[PDB]
């Protein structure tokens, strides 16, 4: 019927298959300087308790391309993130994207403005090259800092970029500009937590704001930081320490489809 969240359940105080996907960047498979590692890692995971057929490696060329439509492939998804001293923002955008679940609608910029419902609303724009120009309106629907029917007047907020999590003031409409042939934009809201994906930042200084509100920028126990000099040491740091990690995650939050955000065609 409805799974019945409308009759409470009362226990007491006196009563007491498996999958794992492992994401990694490409320069790791470079520094390995081998070609048959997957087998050995499998055997080791077997030692720790996982049956042959549960250690899956997915690979992305870079933090940029992996942005396009992130993929969920396991009930446990751990992702390795190579640090940048100059690309940190996009890193935090990736974390804010996949760590949480989004509920997104498609945006046809042709015939309507848009407005956001509450503070939980944002715009996820994805693609290989995404140029997002904007400008807001007034009470009588007039361009400001922009001539509403002239494009070069629009405000360049992210240029030919790859992943953007736009947030705009709530209660004010806006006109948009996008070359849709090379990108997509989606109007969504943040639903809440996920417990399937975790990120290990190789190197880095724990720069991760998964909030749009500034007054907070915390870290749940799902963002782990590790220092590194050669990848094999880090793979061992992971595989020798799977247990704490699993005790952090909680499998039940797997979603059926493969897309990171719920779509409403």
């Amino acid at each position: 019927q409805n799974y019945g969240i409308n009759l409470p359940i009362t226990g007491s105080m006196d009563i007491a298959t498996s999958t794992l996907c492992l994401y990694y960047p490409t320069e790791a498979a470079t520094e390995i300087n081998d070609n048959s590692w997957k087998d050995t890692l499998s055997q080791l995971f077997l030692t720790k308790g996982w049956p042959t057929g549960s250690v899956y490696f997915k690979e992305y060329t870079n933090i940029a391309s992996f942005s396009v439509d992130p993929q969920l492939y396991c009930d446990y998804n751990v992702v390795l993130m190579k640090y940048d001293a100059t690309l940190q923002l996009d890193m935090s955008e990736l974390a804010d994207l996949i760590l949480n679940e989004w509920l997104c609608n498609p945006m046809d910029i042709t015939l309507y403005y848009y407005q956001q419902t509450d503070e939980a609303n944002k715009w996820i724009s994805m693609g290989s090259s995404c140029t997002i120009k904007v400008c807001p309106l007034n009470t009588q629907t007039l361009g400001i800092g922009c001539l509403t029917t002239d494009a070069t007047t629009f405000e360049e907020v992210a240029t030919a970029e790859k992943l953007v999590i736009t947030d705009v003031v709530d209660g004010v409409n806006h006109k948009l500009d996008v070359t849709t042939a090379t990108c997509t934009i989606r109007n969504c809201k943040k639903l809440g937590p996920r417990e399937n994906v975790a990120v290990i930042q190789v190197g880095g200084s724990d720069i991760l704001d998964i909030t749009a509100d500034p007054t907070t920028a915390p870290q749940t126990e799902r963002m782990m930081r590790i220092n590194w000099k050669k990848w094999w040491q880090v793979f061992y740091t992971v595989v020798d320490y799977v247990d704490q990690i699993i005790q952090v995650m909680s499998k039940r939050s797997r979603s059926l489809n493969s897309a990171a955000f719920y779509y409403r065609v």
């Binding site: 409470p8 359940i9 226990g11 937590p193 007054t215 749940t220 909680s250």
Partner: protein, 397 residues
């Protein structure tokens, strides 16, 4: 039944109302009473003992009578008496014991103990000295079917239960929203916890509720209502509702508003009170309903601002809490209390001699399961054994 109380209070008055010296008038009544009690008790063979491990015991009575014409009491009198005095004490203690472990599924108003069942025969109904104490009085009024009751300091009436109602939850356990409550003896301490701090509820206000059904009807009781629960205000780790893991809970208290207490009877409101604390009164009721609310404050301050966002990551959950304690009451159904040694004596007797156990009681007179399934037939059996226990508490410890 009451004949036993006659025996007991007579022997008390024997041990005490007679001391060396007194004038004949002061106890003349009692001396005649006791001489008649003597000429009564003799001449009837008794066998007492033979259940569990209590030994079979033969009993006969043959003793002279007491001085009937005297000026001032002398020690020879009390010396002649105390022997048979203590002998009677021993026999009546045996009566109490032999009685206070019997079982009866369908009865418990007539005797069930051999010498006792013999003794409630009308042929002895010449020893009814006086019936002046709570239990015997309630008994001899329950026989004549009037309004009756006992007054209790700290009545142990709410069955002990540690259970918690859940109204919003998910198997990640980061947005709990529910209520916990603990019940024991005379007190009930409740708290309602919100992770969200009513940040998504309608009207910046959220509700908590609690129902407590008693198992018997009380009347005219004192309720101490204190608006700050103590037992639910600290970091706790409690197990899940069906059990695969545990979960955590770190509350923080705020003061409740718009609270409502109601004592209802048979589905009808009898007492209803709004945000009044301290001491309140109950007149006729068996159901307690508590309904209160938690509000997100209209304005905040720095720490209050860091602790209550709208965001997902919550770390300090908030709570509200109430304590309702029934301190003294008057009731019809007999209840074990914390002002005497009755239930204690019952359990000591049961342990003392290894009674055959049946469903006429929960095994061992452990109070919890008993009041859980409080049954009027069990109540009859219990009242009988309790009056006999109190009778015992007048003679010997």
């Amino acid at each position: 039944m009451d004949v036993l109380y006659s025996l007991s209070k007579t022997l008390k008055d024997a041990r005490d109302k007679i001391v060396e010296g007194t004038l004949y008038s002061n106890v003349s009544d009692l001396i005649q009473q006791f001489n008649q009690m003597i000429i009564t008790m003799n001449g009837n063979e008794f066998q007492t003992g033979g259940i569990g491990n209590l030994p079979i015991r033969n009993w006969n009575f043959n003793f002279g009578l007491l001085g009937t014409t005297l000026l001032n009491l002398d020690a020879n009198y009390v010396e002649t008496a105390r022997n048979t005095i203590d002998y009677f004490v021993d026999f009546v203690d045996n009566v109490c014991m032999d009685e206070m472990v019997r079982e009866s599924q369908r009865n418990g108003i007539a005797p069930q103990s051999d010498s006792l069942r013999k003794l409630s025969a009308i042929k002895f109904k010449r020893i009814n000295f006086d019936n002046s104490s709570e239990y015997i009085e309630n008994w001899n009024l329950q026989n004549r079917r009037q309004r009756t009751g006992f007054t209790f300091h700290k009545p142990n009436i709410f069955p002990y239960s540690a259970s918690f109602t859940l109204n919003r939850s998910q198997p990640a356990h980061d947005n709990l929203m529910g209520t916990m409550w603990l019940n024991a003896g005379s007190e009930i301490q409740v708290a309602g916890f919100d992770y969200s701090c009513a940040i998504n509820a309608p009207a910046n206000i959220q509700q908590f509720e609690h129902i407590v059904p008693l198992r018997r009807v009380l009347t005219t009781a004192t309720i101490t209502l204190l608006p700050d629960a103590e037992r639910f205000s600290f970091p706790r780790v409690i197990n899940s509702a069906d059990g695969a893991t545990t979960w955590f809970f770190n509350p923080v208290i705020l003061r409740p508003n718009n609270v409502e207490v109601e004592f209802l009877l048979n589905g009808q409101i009898i007492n209803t009170y709004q945000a009044r604390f301290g001491t309140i009164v109950a007149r006729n009721f068996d159901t307690i309903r508590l309904s209160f609310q938690l509000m997100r404050p209209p304005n905040m301050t720095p720490a209050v601002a860091v602790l209550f966002p709208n965001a997902q990551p919550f770390e300090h959950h908030a709570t509200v809490g109430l304590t309702l304690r029934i301190e003294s009451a008057v009731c019809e159904s007999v209840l074990a209390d914390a002002s005497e040694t009755l239930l204690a004596n019952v359990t000591s007797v049961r342990q003392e001699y290894a009674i055959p156990v049946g469903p006429v009681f929960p095994p061992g007179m452990n109070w919890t399961d008993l009041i859980t399934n409080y049954s009027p037939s069990r109540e009859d059996n219990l009242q009988r054994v309790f009056t006999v226990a109190s009778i015992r508490s007048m003679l010997i410890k």
